[PDB]
Amino acid sequence: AVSETSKEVWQDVSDFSKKSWASISAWGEEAFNTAGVWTDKSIATGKEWLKAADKELNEMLNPKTAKEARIAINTMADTALIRLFNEQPSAKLLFDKAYGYAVFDSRKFSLMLHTNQGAGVAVNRKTGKHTYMKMFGAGLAAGIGGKFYQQVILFEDKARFDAFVTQGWEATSEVGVVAGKESAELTAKYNGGMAIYQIGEKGLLLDANISGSKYWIDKDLTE
């Protein structure tokens, strides 16, 4: 009756959304942790999942607590990988060989973020460890990616990943950037295993210099 439906109104208006997202939130990880080619079916399902994920990310913007931020960034990172594979299926084959990866987004999923910065995370695929990080994007400052920007870095080799997550990084050239000129497999081979993708809403950003960018550990978020 009304007593019960009333309680339903508070409960479902407050929580039904989170429960609905929780029923599908695993899809991205489940999909990308299964080795193999990123097929047309995976692309189509991924696009459908991204519709829901981006609605959820809208609700996650501007987190108030470190826990909320870590959750938001983690969710963002899953979306970037799916978006990347949908835009460039070959990247899935490189991801399958990755020791680790990092993802940054210009949206405010960290506690603090300034214009031209990105919030993100580096994930060690062997140990599971997440290192929360921030970036200054030279391309953002130059005027690209204004409506939407993600950056995905794949690390085939442990040494460069370990350096990235312990020391941070500064980009002093375009070495490592996937820029429409060659296989990312080759980019990585000649860059200590490291390949950098820049992602727009509709496709890869292929002419966006990163030189001048900086990457550091977000001390307000990582434990």
Side-chain angles (χ1 to χ4, degrees), residues 9 17 20 25 27 30 34 76-77 124 140 149 153 189 199 210 212 217 220-221:
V9 165
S17 160
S20 285
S25 61
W27 185 86
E30 297 188 288
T34 305
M76 176 283 293
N124 182 321
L140 293 172
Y149 183 82
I153 309 179
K189 174 175 175 183
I199 295 150
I210 70 168
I217 299 166
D220 291 326
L221 284 195

Coordinates of all heavy atoms in Angstrom, one line a residue, residues 9 17 20 25 27 30 34 76-77 124 140 149 153 189 199 210 212 217 220-221:
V9 N 9.6 4.8 -3.1 CA 9.9 6.1 -3.7 C 11.2 6.6 -3.2 O 12.1 7.0 -4.0 CB 8.8 7.1 -3.5 CG1 9.2 8.6 -3.8 CG2 7.6 6.8 -4.3
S17 N 19.2 3.5 -9.5 CA 20.2 4.0 -10.5 C 21.5 3.3 -10.2 O 22.1 2.7 -11.1 CB 20.3 5.5 -10.4 OG 21.6 5.8 -11.0
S20 N 21.1 -0.4 -10.9 CA 21.1 -0.7 -12.3 C 22.5 -0.6 -12.9 O 22.9 -1.5 -13.7 CB 20.1 0.3 -13.1 OG 18.8 0.0 -12.8
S25 N 28.1 -2.9 -14.6 CA 29.4 -2.1 -14.5 C 30.6 -3.0 -14.9 O 31.6 -2.5 -15.3 CB 29.5 -1.5 -13.1 OG 29.5 -2.5 -12.1
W27 N 30.9 -5.1 -17.3 CA 31.0 -5.6 -18.6 C 32.4 -5.3 -19.3 O 33.0 -6.1 -19.9 CB 29.9 -5.1 -19.5 CG 30.0 -5.7 -20.9 CD1 29.4 -6.9 -21.3 CD2 30.7 -5.2 -22.0 NE1 29.8 -7.2 -22.6 CE2 30.5 -6.1 -23.1 CE3 31.4 -4.0 -22.3 CZ2 31.1 -5.9 -24.3 CZ3 32.0 -3.9 -23.5 CH2 31.8 -4.8 -24.5
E30 N 35.2 -7.4 -18.0 CA 35.0 -8.8 -18.4 C 35.4 -9.0 -19.8 O 36.0 -9.9 -20.2 CB 33.6 -9.3 -18.1 CG 33.2 -9.3 -16.6 CD 31.8 -10.0 -16.4 OE1 30.8 -9.4 -16.8 OE2 31.8 -11.1 -15.9
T34 N 39.4 -10.8 -21.5 CA 39.3 -12.0 -22.3 C 40.2 -11.7 -23.6 O 39.9 -10.9 -24.4 CB 37.9 -12.2 -22.8 OG1 36.9 -12.2 -21.7 CG2 37.7 -13.5 -23.5
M76 N 35.9 5.5 -15.3 CA 36.4 6.2 -16.5 C 37.4 5.4 -17.3 O 37.3 5.3 -18.5 CB 37.0 7.6 -16.1 CG 37.6 8.4 -17.2 SD 39.2 7.8 -17.8 CE 40.2 8.2 -16.3
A77 N 38.3 4.8 -16.6 CA 39.4 4.1 -17.2 C 38.9 2.9 -18.1 O 39.3 2.7 -19.2 CB 40.4 3.6 -16.2
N124 N 48.6 -1.9 -12.9 CA 49.5 -3.0 -13.1 C 48.7 -4.2 -13.3 O 47.9 -4.6 -12.5 CB 50.5 -3.1 -11.9 CG 51.5 -4.2 -12.2 OD1 51.3 -5.2 -12.8 ND2 52.7 -3.9 -11.7
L140 N 45.8 19.7 -24.8 CA 44.7 20.4 -24.2 C 45.0 21.9 -24.2 O 44.2 22.7 -24.7 CB 44.3 20.0 -22.8 CG 43.8 18.5 -22.7 CD1 43.7 18.1 -21.2 CD2 42.4 18.4 -23.4
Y149 N 38.2 14.4 -24.1 CA 39.6 14.0 -24.3 C 39.9 12.9 -23.3 O 39.8 13.0 -22.1 CB 40.6 15.1 -24.1 CG 42.0 14.7 -24.3 CD1 42.5 14.7 -25.6 CD2 42.8 14.4 -23.3 CE1 43.8 14.3 -25.8 CE2 44.1 14.0 -23.5 CZ 44.6 14.0 -24.8 OH 45.9 13.6 -25.0
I153 N 47.6 5.0 -22.3 CA 49.0 4.6 -22.5 C 49.1 3.1 -22.2 O 48.6 2.6 -21.2 CB 49.9 5.3 -21.6 CG1 49.7 6.8 -21.7 CG2 51.4 5.0 -21.9 CD1 50.6 7.7 -20.8
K189 N 57.5 -1.0 -29.7 CA 58.8 -1.7 -29.7 C 60.0 -0.8 -29.6 O 60.9 -1.2 -28.9 CB 58.9 -2.5 -31.1 CG 60.2 -3.1 -31.2 CD 60.3 -4.0 -32.5 CE 61.7 -4.5 -32.7 NZ 61.8 -5.3 -34.0
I199 N 42.3 10.0 -27.7 CA 41.0 9.5 -28.0 C 40.0 10.7 -28.0 O 39.9 11.4 -27.0 CB 40.5 8.5 -27.0 CG1 41.5 7.2 -27.1 CG2 39.1 8.1 -27.1 CD1 41.6 6.5 -25.8
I210 N 52.1 16.0 -27.9 CA 52.0 15.9 -26.4 C 53.3 16.5 -25.8 O 53.3 16.6 -24.6 CB 51.9 14.4 -25.9 CG1 53.1 13.6 -26.2 CG2 50.7 13.8 -26.6 CD1 53.1 12.2 -25.5
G212 N 55.8 18.5 -23.8 CA 55.5 19.4 -22.8 C 54.6 18.9 -21.7 O 54.5 19.4 -20.6
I217 N 52.0 11.4 -9.6 CA 51.2 10.6 -8.7 C 50.3 11.6 -8.0 O 50.8 12.6 -7.5 CB 52.0 9.8 -7.7 CG1 52.9 8.8 -8.4 CG2 51.1 9.2 -6.7 CD1 54.0 8.2 -7.5
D220 N 46.6 12.9 -3.2 CA 45.4 12.9 -2.5 C 44.5 11.7 -2.6 O 43.6 11.5 -1.9 CB 44.6 14.2 -2.9 CG 45.3 15.5 -2.4 OD1 45.9 15.4 -1.3 OD2 45.3 16.5 -3.1
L221 N 45.0 10.7 -3.4 CA 44.0 9.6 -3.9 C 44.7 8.3 -3.7 O 44.0 7.3 -3.3 CB 43.7 9.9 -5.3 CG 42.6 11.0 -5.6 CD1 42.1 10.9 -7.0 CD2 41.5 11.0 -4.5

